[PDB]
Amino acid sequence: ILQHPDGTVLKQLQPPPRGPRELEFYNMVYAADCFDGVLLELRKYLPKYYGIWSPPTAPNDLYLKLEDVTHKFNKPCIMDVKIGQKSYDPFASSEKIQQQVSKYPLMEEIGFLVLGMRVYHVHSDSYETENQHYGRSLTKETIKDGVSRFFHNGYCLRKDAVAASIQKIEKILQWFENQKQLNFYASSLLFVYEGSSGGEVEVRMIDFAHVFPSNTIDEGYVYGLKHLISVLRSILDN
């Protein structure tokens, strides 16, 4: 991700077939002539999409131009959470399924994985960050405390941001309960709250390298959303 001061991010297309698949997804969703009620509703939960971009002197170098969801925040606290029971797609080989399950073999039980967080601490005027190893180290026993950390500013638990997150996830969950034309593997929710405030939160869907047409509910995604909501709910009892 490259932040731009014009309030957008440029995401470089990943290698084939992932990058091309993601470009195609955004193009389908944000088709100018799209009248599909499901896809029109979905746009509410994605970053705004400004089309494909490439440097003036480099047509080969493909990016997606996306809304920077963190632009309107003073001290944005950011967490990326992968959603679902399977991070591998319907066209994965045995080798690839094994790779994907191994990266975080706990995916099926929990239904989500924290990919990283960046949390502003008020009393130090500074950021702590966690990388992919943090979330991959979380278990059933420690997932609640693991997620809680995102909402801890170093004096209070931000239950306002927790409750707001639940309410925004609930809307995404309602979208998933009302569609059976897309299944999402290895896709994420991006959480952003204001670290500096009260209950002002972004929750957006990102990372669409493994979205496929379907004829079923995305039961894996739903399981993950619900577990994540359940965890956030229990954090409110702290």
Ligand SMILES: Cc1cc(C)cc(-c2onc3ccc([C@H]4C[C@@H]4C(=O)O)cc23)c1
């Ligand atoms: C972690 C982080 C840090 C910072 C600083 C910004 C963002 C960020 O803010 N708005 C965003 C909109 C879309 C995306 C998605 C392209 C990314 C993907 O698909 O992996 C990332 C975005 C994220």
